[PDB]
Amino acid sequence: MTPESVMMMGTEAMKVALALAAPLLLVALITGLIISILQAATQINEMTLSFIPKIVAVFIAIIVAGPWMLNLLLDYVRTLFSNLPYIIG
Amino acid sequence: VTSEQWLYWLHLYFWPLLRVLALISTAPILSERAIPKRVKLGLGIMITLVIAPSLPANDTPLFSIAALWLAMQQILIGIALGFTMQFAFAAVRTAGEFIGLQMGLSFATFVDPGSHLNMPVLARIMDMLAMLLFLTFNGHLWLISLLVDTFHTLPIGSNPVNSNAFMALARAGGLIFLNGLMLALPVITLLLTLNLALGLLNRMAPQLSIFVIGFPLTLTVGIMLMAALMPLIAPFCEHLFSEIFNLLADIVS
Amino acid sequence: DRLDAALRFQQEALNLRAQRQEILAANIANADTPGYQARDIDFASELKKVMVRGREETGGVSSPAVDLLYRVPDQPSLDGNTVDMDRERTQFADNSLKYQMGLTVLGSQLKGMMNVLQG
Amino acid sequence: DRLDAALRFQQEALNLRAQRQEILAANIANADTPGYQARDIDFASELKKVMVVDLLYRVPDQPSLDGNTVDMDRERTQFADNSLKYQMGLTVLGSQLKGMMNVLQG
Amino acid sequence: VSFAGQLHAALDRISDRQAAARVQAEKFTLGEPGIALNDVMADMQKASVSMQMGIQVRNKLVAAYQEVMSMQV
Amino acid sequence: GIALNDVMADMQKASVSMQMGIQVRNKLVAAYQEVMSMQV
Amino acid sequence: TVSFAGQLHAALDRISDRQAAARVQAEKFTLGEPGIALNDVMADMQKASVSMQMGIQVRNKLVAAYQEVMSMQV
Amino acid sequence: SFAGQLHAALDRISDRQAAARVQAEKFTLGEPGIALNDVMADMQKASVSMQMGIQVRNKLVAAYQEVMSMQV
Amino acid sequence: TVSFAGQLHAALDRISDRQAAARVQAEKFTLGEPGIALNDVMADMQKASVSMQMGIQVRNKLVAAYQEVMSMQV
Amino acid sequence: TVSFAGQLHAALDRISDRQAAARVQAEKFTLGEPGIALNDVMADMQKASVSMQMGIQVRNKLVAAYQEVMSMQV
Amino acid sequence: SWSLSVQTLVFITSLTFLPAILLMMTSFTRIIIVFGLLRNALGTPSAPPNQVLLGLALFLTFFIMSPVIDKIYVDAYQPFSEQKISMQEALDKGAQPLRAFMLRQTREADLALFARLANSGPLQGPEAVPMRILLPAYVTSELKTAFQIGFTIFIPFLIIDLVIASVLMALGMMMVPPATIALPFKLMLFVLVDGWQLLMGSLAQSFYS
Amino acid sequence: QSWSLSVQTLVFITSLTFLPAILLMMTSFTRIIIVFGLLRNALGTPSAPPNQVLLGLALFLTFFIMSPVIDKIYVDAYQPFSEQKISMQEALDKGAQPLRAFMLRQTREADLALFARLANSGPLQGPEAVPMRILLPAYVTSELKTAFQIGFTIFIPFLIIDLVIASVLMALGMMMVPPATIALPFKLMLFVLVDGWQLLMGSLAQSF
Amino acid sequence: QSWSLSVQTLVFITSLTFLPAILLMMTSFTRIIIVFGLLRNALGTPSAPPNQVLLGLALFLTFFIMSPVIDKIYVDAYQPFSEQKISMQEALDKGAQPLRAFMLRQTREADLALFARLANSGPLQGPEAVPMRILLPAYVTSELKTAFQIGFTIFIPFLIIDLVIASVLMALGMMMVPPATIALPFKLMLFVLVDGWQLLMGSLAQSF
Amino acid sequence: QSWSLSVQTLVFITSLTFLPAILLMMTSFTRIIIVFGLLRNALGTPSAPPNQVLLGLALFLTFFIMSPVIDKIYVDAYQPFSEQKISMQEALDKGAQPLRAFMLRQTREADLALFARLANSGPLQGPEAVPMRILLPAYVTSELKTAFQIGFTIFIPFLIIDLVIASVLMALGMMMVPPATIALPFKLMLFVLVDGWQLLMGSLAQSFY
Amino acid sequence: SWSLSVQTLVFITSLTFLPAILLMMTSFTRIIIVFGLLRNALGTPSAPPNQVLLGLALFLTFFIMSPVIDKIYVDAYQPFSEQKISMQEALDKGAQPLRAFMLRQTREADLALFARLANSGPLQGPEAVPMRILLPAYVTSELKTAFQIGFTIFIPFLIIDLVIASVLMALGMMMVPPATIALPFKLMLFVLVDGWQLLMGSLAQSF
């Protein structure tokens, strides 16, 4: 009820969002950086060949860590809906 | 006996109802479409039932241009109060949308302005957070109390009016921008530095950077930055509400 | 103000009809009382008078500010009352129909207004 | 039912008036029977008893030789009065029902 | 004192008039002396008129409430 | 005291005035919502 | 444990038994059975009519309220 | 033009109403030469004309609202 | 194999037969055919009117319900 | 080629013709014409009223259908 | 007591205000506001059709207001039906359990504000609060509670859209709308975590707590 | 014991007011209409088939699905009531049985358990002890959940097409094009080459 | 057997109530309306022709297409009824046949089989005896499928134009130039030059 | 032969409902608003002047365009109606002819031929004998085609500006600069200096002649 | 003076056209278009909500109509009570200040075009321009004025965007999008100079 509880609500929610999005974004960033440094080493420059492995890497990311995200988000939503009638004002 | 003078009761219960309902239809949270219309009408009716008997009853007939002037006055007062209150949420929405646009979340606006493709999701997040904070600080009760109080300052009866006062509400349009800049400032600046950092990377081997490495990094950095910045809005939320409230108190009179 | 002024003539005429019928009923009630002169009012003159200057009362025992005039007797009577029953019952029926006419006109005007307002 | 309690008094009065009307007409019909006693009921007491019948003999006025105590004038007046009161009870009960109806109509 | 108070007062007055007329009618039907049929019938007439007045006031009042609740906010 | 003639007439006049006020406010509110439902 | 459906069933029963009692009284009075009076027959019929008007008005109010509640938008 | 025709129609309807009201007012005072049936017929004709005006206003307002609600 | 249109057709036809029977009975009574009583003629006419009014009310309820069902935003 | 406008014009002409015939017969009866009876005048007026009411109801249904069809979002 | 005609008239007139009692004195407002907000959240403004949600809200309100209705029936309707309590006293007796139910769920701040706006004297205990103060205080408290519940409801459905947009933006697909992708995932979430049982139980507890 | 004919007429004509409510809450109309709306959202165009066509088609589908239940009601309740062999109340009680079975067969256990918890129900026992006022909201909740389960998996192929087209377009280089604009004709192609309408009706019918 | 006059007019008004449903689900209005909406979406102009204009065009096209069916109904069914030659029941039965034939001409056998198998209908010999309750949903489904086919095919030339302009812009290096702004005027020019409106209406009419 | 007063009133009020349909399918309005719907797209601001401003401006322009037709209808048909020298049927027959001529002069022959063939009409001797059922949809089709022609032609100078600005931006190596935002103010410049609105309305009015 | 019921009908009917009066007769279109163009300038099409912009334009319109409202009050509101002039002579007398304002804000070319569109040859004087010719001409003039003000607003933001892009290109960066960098600088320039208050002051001065 108190504004401290509200702002905590937003923080924990958006940290959950950060945890959900961090693996995919970080995998894409690492793949892009690796392809870019390889291009710099080989002196190859086409703006389209960096887009190819990124999709494959990010799609594999759901294969490997997808169940973890799905279990984390469901637990968050379940706990939020269960604690809903105790943060009422 | 068995009089029950109806015109007296109607004139006593009408104009306060007009002002209360005019505030209701525009005041934030009390004007959200999710509330059924009958609930809003009943709240206005009950508030008027509580308030009106204490006020001096007016005797101007409903079939006169004086009644039209009175109705216009009540509508103006109600919409002015509600809109001045709404300005703070407008400012919060502006700050959130700008943080989100510096995230690169909606890049299609820079190339196709107003092209039916825009999602200010951060703006919505902080808008609903601001609504929750406003509910917590009981701002709506204050709004109702000030709606009641503006009578003593400005009675139902037609009273003369001023000018630059309207400018003040219009000049409040500056606040939406001015306060929005500060909220952002605590994050956009660092994001700016990050973009500057990306520039240093592009000053190296040409191409092979930006649109491939900049976007995910800046998205994650914006996310964690403003996630850490979330505790900061609440003092600024109270500052915004106080600014709107004392501006209203000073200018309505 | 405007609506009050527009409906004021028929309302006042209907009130004067009611008072005239009260007077006629009083005449009918006292029809066998010895020494009772029948009373009646001039409807048109009193209606214009109430029109120009608002309704007023003698007290308020209360009674209207109307002028109670005496009816001219038809034929003499030993007891000494001038209530001739034919005249009383003709005026009663005529006042009845005119009051119903006033009700009809006022109701028609009020519907003629709800028709405009209703939407 | 509450509806019965409102209309109980008038219904009982109407029924008692009908019964006493029958008794008075029986007294009229048997006027010529030698040895017939004129019988009647006390309306108020029986109305109390039903709201909360016994026949009472009429006090003879003139002594006849055949033992008949029925008097024409007394019972004719009572018969007319009972008819009038039956009509009045019908009027009152109908007015109450009509009021209960116009309350509901709409 | 208030509008609800005035309506309650009007209802009480109408009910009291109706009960008085009914009680006088029952007293006349009882056979108690001094009660005239003229007064009974006139009082029943007045009670009926008062009931009809109350019905009309209720009808209008309900119509006005329905009109107010139909307002779009 | 006040008769049915006056009671009914003022009762009707009040009903008419209340209906007029309701209709005028509805028109004003509809115009305001049409203005605010704009697209700038 | 109150039951609105049970209360409606009880009220409908009250009306229906009142009507049936009046009808059977009229039945016996037409058949010529002694002990039945015409004024009682008419009074019971009118009581049944009043009860049915009660039921009709309550039905109208309930249906109007339900329709206005269900015509609302969330 | 069109506003002129609307103004003329409104003037005719109001003249109808005024004539009926004046005739009824004169008849209320007991003035001779005015009959009850004529008063009632004039009142009903005025009511019919006013209802026609109301209906025309409703149709015109609905048409204007439908036109102004189009998506350019 | 239950078709609602079939039941509506059956009810409509039954109303029609009742109306036609009442009309023919009145027709025959007017022509002075012995064996027809006025009271039965009026009773059957009133029964036909009751049946037609019941059909009218059922149609009104069905049409209203169809319009409320058919106007929802999908 | 059947056209709906032609059918509507024909129906309107039939309604107008029936109304005009009833009005003419009533006018002639008022003027003291011998070969016209009051019952026929009243029956013809009632039939014209019924026909015009049917026309009004058909117009209402047609207008409702048109306003429903033209309110689509295509 | 009143005449039977007056009692019937009052009963028929009071039957009119049933929607007002349902909306302004009952648990209906919070549930309907929460349902509207949730429908706004999932991105399907016409999904459970208004009638379905209205029926569910009516059944929920009937299940929630059961003890109050039971207390009214046992204390007011039963003595009134048995001719033990007059018609003008059954209303007063039955208005007390509803008043208590409205009080418990109301808030001090609203009560203080509406006690000040009426210029009434000090209210040392809750037993001095009239209905003219409790009614709008209860209404405002219910509105605020419903909006709080809906606004904490809204957060996950916007979180999903945020992460969807960020993931789409990582790969450079800047012209893909995020709402169209997020809607199936929001439906999947609301299916997985017992979308309705948890919400139903949370609302019911929110009343009984 | 039987109700009077006037009471029967009053109840019968009053019950017709709940016909839209019965059709929506108690029958299969809700699930079909929700699935159709979700499919319209998934097609890429929000109002291609007018709401009227979808509503009529959903009504026909609901009638065809519920025809066995309607036949059972007619055999059990309507026919013996119309022949004046059972009373109105007993006919309603008998006819509530097949509809209760239909509602139970598609009811989630958790929904029924929760709504029995909220209604203070204690020793329930046989599946034939659940009252109508408890069974109905549980059925509505289960129908909403099932409709959402169907919709979110109806969404899948169109998301696949959208993602494939966007990925191909951006990887090829044309990143300034709107992928949805090019994708909509392909969504229509997929829907018409699979026979999406016929298969969707088959799946909706076989869901019961 | 002939319905009395009051029953006849009750039936007539109740049937007039169902007019939009008949127009949408029995005539060619739905397919034309769907194709028009898809075409408007295809030009990149979501609100250029107002909805009322397209609705009126679809209504007139439907009237022209259904003129032979209306003529058959008039000649075979309505005309004898208006001359009191036949009753209303047999007139309606005779008028059903031409409309039924028209709807069967434009339905797909697979959808008819689906709705027959779903409704548990017994084997039906030939197209002569197929209930309207079976034919109507199948015809609606077939119309939906055909409309989607036509719209998807229509979407092709504008897709060609968009792709060619996007490629021309991209091969010039213009990386941040959106192709919609350049494509919209050329889409309008293409639709104007081929006499698009009359050609598309003629194609829709010819397909019926 | 004249219709009764009741039938005349019924027909008049019924025909009053077709006012938007008549305005769209029979007057100039369809060509105007559609062009506006495209012009706001050419300027790069979909917001543009508000929708209601454009609609009312189109309405005023339509009235000015149809002033001669309205005057001819008022003179030939409605004036005898008001002065009692004509019936309602004859007035309806006579007043449509100037509007039919106005519709025919802007009707392309190909569309008219298409709708004839589609109605299986017999040999029409001359324009004067063309049925309204054939003239209305053909006029609407030709109207749409003409509006699209005008809109595409309007789209030209703004395309010129966009191409020039994009070429200038790319020739300087400023490849990452979106040219839409830069070229929007120059489109506003072009519309201001040349007096775009007045020129466009004059061109539309002259086009109808 | 005509009937009261007809007066009520006319008044409620004229109440419907209130958005038309606000848009076509007052200046509301000018402020709303200026706000839309300014929002398009900063690069954020949803930063202030459309509701807030509409309300700000409404308040600005109310102030800038306050002199005309005062003239209406003097010429129409007051004498309608003293009954020196009423009904006809006054409604037109009260509308006269609107005519003066719209003549002031209307260009001559639009009026000339709309006159030759109505074949009104003998329109010689400038205070007897009919409403049919005055209204659309005034609307077109308002559109032109709003577009000019929008371009003037556009100039500094376009300059800032161009400067940012030029410095990015000169510094060696060829891939960094200049919009992301230039957006916060656009905002800090807009706030620091206090763009909003000067913008409203100029709009009020713009009449």
Author numbering:
A (entry chain D): 1 to 89
B (entry chain E): 4 to 256
C (entry chain Q): 3 to 62, 78 to 136
D (entry chain U): 3 to 54, 83 to 136
E (entry chain P): 32 to 104
F (entry chain K): 65 to 104
G (entry chain O), I (entry chain N), J (entry chain M): 31 to 104
H (entry chain L): 33 to 104
Question: Would you copy out the relevant sentences from the publication that reported this structure?
Answer:
The bacterial flagellar motor is a huge bidirectional rotary nanomachine that drives rotation of the flagellum for bacterial motility. The cytoplasmic C ring of the flagellar motor functions as the switch complex for the rotational direction switching from counterclockwise to clockwise. The basal body is made up of the LP ring, MS ring, C ring, rod and export apparatus. Here, we present two high-resolution cryo-electron microscopy structures of the C ring-containing flagellar basal body–hook complex from Salmonella Typhimurium, which are in the default counterclockwise state and in a constitutively active CheY mutant-induced clockwise state, respectively.
To obtain the C ring-containing basal body–hook complex in the CW state, we constructed the constitutively active double mutant D13K/Y106W of CheY (hereafter referred to as CheY**), which can mimic CheY-P to tightly bind to the C ring and lock the rotational direction of the motor in the CW state. The density maps of the LP ring, MS ring, rod, hook, and export apparatus in the CW state were locally reconstructed to the higher resolutions ranging from 2.8 Å to 3.8 Å. Although the structures of the LP ring, MS ring, rod, hook, and export apparatus in the CW state are highly similar to those of these components in the CCW state, the protomers of the C ring in the CW state notably undergo inclination and compaction, suggesting that the binding of CheY** induces significant conformational changes of the C ring for rotational switching. The LP ring acts as a bushing to stabilize the rotation of the rod, which serves as the drive shaft. The hook functions as a joint that connects the motor to the filament, which acts as a propeller to propel bacteria for swimming in liquid medium and swarming on solid surface.
